[PDB]
Paper text:
Coronavirus trimeric spike (S) glycoproteins mediate viral entry. S1 adopts dynamic conformations in cryo-EM structures of prefusion MERS-CoV, SARS-CoV, and SARS-CoV-2, wherein RBDs adopt either a “down” conformation that buries the receptor-binding surface, or an “up” conformation that facilitates binding with host-cell receptors. Here, we report the isolation of a potent neutralizing monoclonal antibody, MERS-S41, from a yeast displayed scFv library using the S protein as the bait. By combining cell surface staining assays with cryo-EM structural analysis of MERS-S41 in complex with the MERS-CoV spike trimer, we have demonstrated that MERS-S41 inhibits MERS-CoV entry by blocking binding to the receptor DPP4.
Residue numbers in the entry:
A (entry chain A): 386 to 626
B (entry chain K): 1 to 212
C (entry chain H): 1 to 221
Write the structure that this text describes.
């Protein structure tokens, strides 16, 4: 619901939603939006839909379908280099979706915008070092850039405090034409736990596990740390509930 | 791109009198996104006020930026001969940014009596090219100074080309250099070339004299 | 503070490729944007293009987009604009101005400027008219002698008394078009001495397209 509420941020200003210990329904979110492009790295998309892992990390931003290739760790495109990076070590699933007309409460930004270049001038006048975004981190040059880039060509500069480093930080702003239907890119970086699986798919429990399915039948019961062989018969409640 | 109205331009302003320049915008612009540029004659424009709020480094406090959203006014506390120049208001709220049409400022400290010099055509100019004739009107203020050429003490048609320099930064005076183009071959009957000058300066127009 | 300088004025045929060069002083480029401004004669300044050397980004005005290629390099320390296919009407003075940023589109400093004229006509060498000092002169108060450059096709010739040593008493008048296509400008100086003057050597003349500097000794007559 927080992802649905409000307006999705730009790729550089992407907000982070983290779910550690809750039942998850990725399929329901996939049903709500129309996903034009689905891809995953280090795991199957079907496996990601139905598996238990220690934690789930979801990043939501407005990304157009046309520049999806640029935002890849393998790609040398500037947007991936200076805006959003996804950790290679954790399995990463990348989903691009277009909001349906029926879906409501999704505010649309005036245009999609990205940081064309992020660089820091060195203390030496003739020396400049480019700054490359580390995994996530919301981008190094995000502070100079406004939430939506004002013009297709923009120049941003700010000066770091000396000692350190007393070096100007320079950023570029670029924009792309807004699509009639808003397009949003989602980056997911779930972390698997060898001994811990706090977040599990909805609904993990099944009818066979439920006593009502096996009522009247000799069955093995493993409920709340008690293991035994017994037959369950429906009867009037007795004892402390 | 915003179309912007501008003040009419040339005005007669005494020194020590406040001067106001109007920069209305037809299309709405940011409340403080306007740059004032002053260019001296034959000089590059220099920023005076940035954002129409604060003077740029090295710019006198007397120049001030006032007004917001649509109309921007530049007011100068004191007026000097150096102050007179062309002023442009640039609105950078909308891109492409649009510079002002510009308003020339004229300061007249006092009326200046014209000094008239006649330059007789040299022999070298006769030997090569058309000798022609040259007349000078140094320190003739205001700009409206009229010189008519006289050939052989007889009325001559005003085909002469005259150039008047802009006011000096400190002198604030105008100098005019009317020149009559005469073919070297056509130098026989005419013996005298003169430039009578009619101006506010001087009691009466004075004819000149060449002979030689 | 970096002083801003621009290439010498040049004359080209219409549609020719012409490059105007603006160089940051000190052999190094500061982290500032470079803007190109075209001013038509007797007209308001018009922004043409914005290039930042450190960013490497290039932007142009809608009126003149794709007809101009602008390249700025920090290592070169020089920002230059190349204009090709420009119409004859496009001729105007060009200025390069420092930019604080997109959030700060105000130019603290401006370049001296380059005048480019696009016409299909042959350039004409300038001819200096004789000083012809006035026969009637003040008796020791001042003496008026002026050498005027004439018959020069390409603006602007620069004329300096004593190679620019004498900046006092000199009056320069802007070139005025005559009936002939060639146009001329006027230079005169006033020297307190009736004869000789402050310096015997004066009227050094340089033509910006010619790039030739000539010094002539001057004697009052």
């Amino acid at each position: 619901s927080p992802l649905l509420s409000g307006t999705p941020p730009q790729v550089y200003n992407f907000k982070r939603l983290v779910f550690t210990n809750c039942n998850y329904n990725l399929t329901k979110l996939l049903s709500l939006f129309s996903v034009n492009d689905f891809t995953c790295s280090q795991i199957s998309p079907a496996a990601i839909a139905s598996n238990c892992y220690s934690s789930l990390i979801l990043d939501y931003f407005s990304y157009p379908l046309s520049m999806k290739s640029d935002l890849s760790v393998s790609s040398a495109g500037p947007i991936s280099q200076f805006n959003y990076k996804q950790s290679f070590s954790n399995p990463t699933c990348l989903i691009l979706a277009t909001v349906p007309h029926n879906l409501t409460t999704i505010t649309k930004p005036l245009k999609y915008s990205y940081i064309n270049k992020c660089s820091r001038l060195l203390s030496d006048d003739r020396t400049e070092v480019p700054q490359l975004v580390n995994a996530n981190q919301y981008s190094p040059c995000v502070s100079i850039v406004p939430s939506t880039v004002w013009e297709d060509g923009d120049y941003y500069r700010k000066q770091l405090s000396p000692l350190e480093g007393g070096g100007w930080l320079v950023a570029s702003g670029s924009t792309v034409a807004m699509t009639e239907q808003l397009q949003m890119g989602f980056g997911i970086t779930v972390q698997y736990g060898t001994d811990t699986n706090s977040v599990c798919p909805k609904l993990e429990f099944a009818n066979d596990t439920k006593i009502a399915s096996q009522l009247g039948n000799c069955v093995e019961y493993s409920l709340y740390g008690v293991s035994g062989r017994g037959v369950f018969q429906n009867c009037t409640a007795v004892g402390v509930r | 791109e915003i179309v912007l109205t501008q003040s009419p331009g040339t005005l007669s302003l005494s020194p020590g009198e406040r001067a106001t320049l109007s920069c209305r915008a037809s299309q709405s612009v940011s409340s403080s996104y306007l740059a004032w540029y002053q260019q001296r004659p034959g000089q590059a424009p220099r920023l005076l006020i940035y954002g129409a709020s604060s003077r740029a480094t090295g710019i006198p406090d007397r120049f001030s930026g006032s007004g917001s959203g649509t109309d921007f006014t530049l007011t100068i506390g004191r007026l000097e001969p150096e102050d007179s120049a062309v002023y442009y208001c640039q609105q950078y709220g909308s891109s492409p940014w649009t510079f002002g049409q510009g308003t020339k400022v004229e300061i007249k400290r006092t009326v200046a009596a014209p000094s008239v010099f006649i330059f007789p055509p040299s022999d070298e100019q006769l030997k090569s090219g058309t000798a022609s004739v040259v007349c000078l009107l140094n320190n003739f203020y205001p700009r409206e100074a009229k010189v008519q050429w006289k050939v052989d003490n007889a009325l001559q048609s005003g085909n002469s080309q005259e150039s008047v320099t802009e006011q000096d930064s400190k002198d604030s005076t105008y100098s005019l250099s009317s020149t009559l183009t005469l073919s070297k071959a056509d130098y026989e009957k005419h013996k005298v070339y003169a430039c009578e000058v009619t101006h506010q300066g001087l009691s009466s127009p004075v004819t000149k004299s060449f002979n030689r | 503070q970096v002083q801003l300088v621009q290439s010498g004025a040049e004359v080209k045929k219409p549609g020719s490729s012409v490059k105007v060069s603006c160089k940051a002083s000190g052999g190094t480029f500061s982290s500032y944007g470079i803007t190109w401004v075209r001013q038509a004669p007797g007209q308001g300044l018009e922004w043409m293009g914005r290039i930042i050397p450190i960013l490497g980004i290039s932007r142009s005005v809608q009126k003149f987009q794709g007809r101009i290629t602008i390249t700025a390099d920090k290592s070169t320390s020089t920002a230059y604009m190349d204009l090709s296919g420009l119409t004859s009407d496009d001729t105007a003075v060009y200025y390069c101005a420092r930019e604080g940023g997109s959030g700060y589109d105000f130019f603290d400093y401006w370049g001296q400027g380059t005048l480019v004229t696009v016409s299909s006509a042959s350039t004409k060498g300038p001819s200096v008219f004789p000083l012809a000092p006035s026969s009637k002169s003040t008796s020791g108060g001042t003496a008026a002698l002026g050498c005027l450059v004439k018959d020069y096709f390409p603006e602007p010739v620069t004329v300096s008394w004593n190679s620019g040593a004498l900046t006092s008493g000199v009056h320069t008048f802007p070139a005025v078009l005559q009936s002939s296509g060639l146009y001329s400008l006027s230079s005169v100086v006033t020297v307190p001495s009736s004869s000789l003057g402050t310096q015997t050597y004066i009227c050094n003349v340089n033509h910006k397209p010619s790039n030739t500097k000539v010094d002539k000794r001057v004697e009052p007559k």
